[PDB]
Design a protein around this nucleic acid. Structure first.
Ligand SMILES: [Cl-]
Ligand SMILES: [Cl-]
Ligand SMILES: [Cl-]
Ligand SMILES: [Cl-]
Ligand SMILES: [Mn+2]
Ligand SMILES: [Mn+2]
Ligand SMILES: [Mn+2]
Ligand SMILES: [Mn+2]
Ligand SMILES: [Mn+2]
Ligand SMILES: [Mn+2]
Ligand SMILES: [Mn+2]
Ligand SMILES: [Mn+2]
Lengths: 81, 97, 94, 105, 98, 84, 93, 104
DNA sequence: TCAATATCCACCTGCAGATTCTACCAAAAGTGTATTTGGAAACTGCTCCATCAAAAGGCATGTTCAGCTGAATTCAGCTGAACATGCCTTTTGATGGAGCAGTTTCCAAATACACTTTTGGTAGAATCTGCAGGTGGATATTGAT
DNA sequence: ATCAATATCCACCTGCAGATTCTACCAAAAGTGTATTTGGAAACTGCTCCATCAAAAGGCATGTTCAGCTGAATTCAGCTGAACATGCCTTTTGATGGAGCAGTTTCCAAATACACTTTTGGTAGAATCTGCAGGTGGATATTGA
């Protein structure tokens, strides 16, 4: 048992921060990070699935994600554009 | 009975993770979260393997970036420990809020 | 002669519908024209992309609808989508 | 001879929106419902902001909407503010807002 | 004589300028700055009057918006006096120099 | 006619103070004034450059307000109010 | 049919600047995304440029102003150089 | 006899042309536009490959991978600015630790 | 410094997984024509920009002066790092079964055309008015005592 | 714990710079009758994608300790705000010449449209190759003393 977002663990969040140059992490950053990560995924996924639904498909494609990302101003290279 | 001083390993991980490029969040947990969120927008969705990969890449690139801007605030507040208000300041000046 | 089109008379009509008593300065109308032109370009722009991403050479009311859902936030989207659909079904009733 | 706008039950110009679509290089062909649907959304959005601007006018004892009124209406509406978050309203000013920590004790 | 304590007129001015919408940089001086900068890029250029106004509006909206972000840094740094260091943090996070 | 020089000094201390006010700033360090001018010049140059590029492309010698609007649109700073 | 990419062209250009160097497929995917992006940005601006000036055709002149507006300083000069060079060469022999 | 060999390019002038026309950008497309655009695309491609090729070498590697394209780009001011809003999958970040975080 | 941990760092080493290299077909790309235009060129009507003159007073510039804010220091409370433990959730590697992108192949509905009428809109005149700017007291809002 | 000193507010007023209306065209919607497609709609396939297993293997979750970071309290030196005296320079109003948009028309050079003819780029196999990951054995970088 346990929540899915809680699946995104402390050590993992630590690792991300570390690649970000962060030397010390307050204990409150973990719940804060999951919330941000959740708002990010919601916005991207919502857009991707909207491209999916428009193409009348049932399968979210990398392109749908790339276009969602492009609209959120987060252009991604490596997946078809 | 050897023990490293607090911060010495922290710096070491920074050097390690800034050198590597692997995804830092475990795949399955992520996949789980993604599908859960996606499930609230349209049910019974399937996902291209690369779609999941594209998604995770974007998220980690966003969190690492957000952690950089948050660190700039901490050093700005003459601190060294990131706090929620620091992430909150960064997201605000970024326009995400 | 050089004649330039604008959305002014339409903005004005809508203004009278919502606030019969209220008027608008031309500087404010200027802003409204910029807004209508901005949203139009955003919608059409997205609709264009949507159409391209699906090898479709034509933009139907369905493209405009997905574009509106992608561009507008929450309620604004739902009310727009409602008005849009409402206007189209009525239009197709001859 | 009925205008497409009246058939659509709209104030905004359906025929003009259609032309703008064809002449905008958005796609090879444009469906008949496309301009109708877009003219409607446009009209709905300008109605939503004129409604709130008119309120701002009213609130400020003015009967004529001016840019500042449009700004107050945009920035006080979570959604329009989001929609126009990267837009600058000439002559609109800012929302009066002083951070708490700055006021006297 | 009578003297307002430091900060009082400052708050008075914030309420005043946030209440108004007029341009805060004098017209002519701004027009010379635009002409000087324009001239250094391309000679013999002419400007529509509204083109000058569009630039001033954009410039002031930009500076004002930058000062709000900068003001968030100051307060976050537990200070109240904006410093170059703060404008820099803001432009940095904004991605004008990320 | 005459040579244009040092006009950035035409953006006075009081004008910068007013802008900071509308921006909600309560206290201003003495060094803020030169930074602001610096930041303003970079912003102006960039917008002037793109605007003039639109002008030049249209084979005109007169920068229109539309040129400026398109310049700003390029920089992700959409401007309402001078569209026609 | 199927999926046409810029792969072979990126590769040819690779061998030109680094004959001894190869490129991972993931890296080829990056280059493709890169070319499609730059292509869209330039064509998009050129499109805008022609519309602003009520033109119905995108000429090398639009592609150029677009490049001027999109590429930073020195990258623009060289691009404008290569660009005009290819068109000059194309017009002659 | 293809337009690319005539234009002296590796990049496909014929494809760039078809892509412009069918891309809904304009009613008509000039003959030189695709040549020019193609030249601009090939040039930027060479620029990145050059810097990334170097990045590979400086790593005792002969095959360019994402990490390399990433270091080439972020370590180059103009490319960096041009791709400032772009995230290179699998590219990571430039190693960089704020002085205030180091000991001594 | 001296010494004992652990960390990094080279220099090799040998497959396993990608890469690179090969051998062949539809589908673009190049031709050769026959028509169309797009939009430059050559005048020219005529907005709209750059300039200049003048006067007025709104504001920018400097200075004095001292309130209180930012920069230093010091202190200790307790938060978050480093670790050794113990455990299970993620990784992965086949195996299928099958949900479903992608095609195909009609074509009926929906669009684009080419031309002709028919208004709805736009560009100024002619009118009609919020409200900008002013003034006076009524109301606070501050800051010294 | 009031009171001077100012700043802020509201209401009442009234001409005019700036909206609304009012007319007259004509650019461009609307109406029609053909000549095209577009893109659904069933029917089918091979992919890819979830599910299921089924173990091991890291990688995470825990509980301790305590180094050292952050926040609190105090100081105080000096910057920056408030208030003045001055008088400069922007703002306001008007008047002009003419630089240069913008509108027309005239019309080739260049782009579009087939109808074909060839060539190239995308695939699905075939034949290497680059490092990844592992092994030492050698100085480093740490941290305790
Ligand atoms: Cl916090
Ligand atoms: Cl439709
Ligand atoms: Cl500073
Ligand atoms: Cl051309
Ligand atoms: Mn109403
Ligand atoms: Mn013509
Ligand atoms: Mn203090
Ligand atoms: Mn202690
Ligand atoms: Mn009529
Ligand atoms: Mn008033
Ligand atoms: Mn071939
Ligand atoms: Mn290795």
């Amino acid at each position: 048992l346990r929540d899915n977002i809680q699946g995104i663990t402390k050590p993992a969040i630590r690792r991300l921060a570390r690649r970000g140059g962060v030397k010390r992490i307050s204990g409150l950053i973990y719940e804060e990070t999951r919330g941000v990560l959740k708002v990010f995924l919601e916005n991207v996924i919502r857009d991707a699935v909207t491209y999916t639904e428009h193409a009348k498909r049932k399968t979210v494609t990398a392109m749908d994600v790339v276009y969602a990302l492009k609209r959120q101003g987060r252009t991604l290279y490596g997946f078809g554009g | 009975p050897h023990r490293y001083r607090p911060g010495t390993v922290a710096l070491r991980e920074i050097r390690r993770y800034q050198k590597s490029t692997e995804l830092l969040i475990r795949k399955l947990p992520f996949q789980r979260l993604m599908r859960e969120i996606a499930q609230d927008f349209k049910t019974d969705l399937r996902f291209q393997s690369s779609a999941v990969m594209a998604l995770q890449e974007a998220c980690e690139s966003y969190l690492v970036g957000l952690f950089e801007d948050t660190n700039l605030c901490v050093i700005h507040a003459k601190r060294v420990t990131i706090m929620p208000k620091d992430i909150q300041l960064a997201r605000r000046i970024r326009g995400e809020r | 002669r050089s004649r330039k089109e604008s959305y002014s008379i339409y903005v004005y009509k809508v203004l009278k519908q919502v606030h019969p008593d209220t008027g608008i300065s031309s500087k404010a109308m200027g802003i409204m024209n910029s807004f209508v032109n901005d949203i139009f370009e955003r919608i059409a722009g997205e609709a264009s992309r949507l159409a391209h991403y699906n090898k479709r050479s034509t933009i139907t009311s369905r493209e405009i609808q997905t574009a509106v859902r992608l561009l507008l936030p929450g309620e604004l989207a739902k009310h727009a989508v409602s008005e849009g659909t409402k206007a189209v079904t009525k239009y197709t009733s001859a | 001879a009925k205008t497409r706008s009246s058939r659509a039950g709209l104030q905004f110009p359906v025929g003009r929106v259609h032309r703008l679509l064809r002449k905008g290089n958005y796609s090879e062909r444009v469906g008949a419902g496309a301009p109708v649907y877009l003219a409607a959304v446009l009209e709905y959005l300008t109605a939503e902001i004129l409604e709130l601007a008119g309120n701002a006018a009213r609130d400020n004892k003015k009967t004529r909407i001016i840019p500042r009124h449009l700004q107050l209406a945009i920035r006080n509406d979570e959604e329009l503010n989001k929609l126009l978050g990267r837009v600058t309203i000439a002559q609109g000013g800012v929302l009066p807002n002083i951070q708490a920590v700055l006021l006297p004790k």
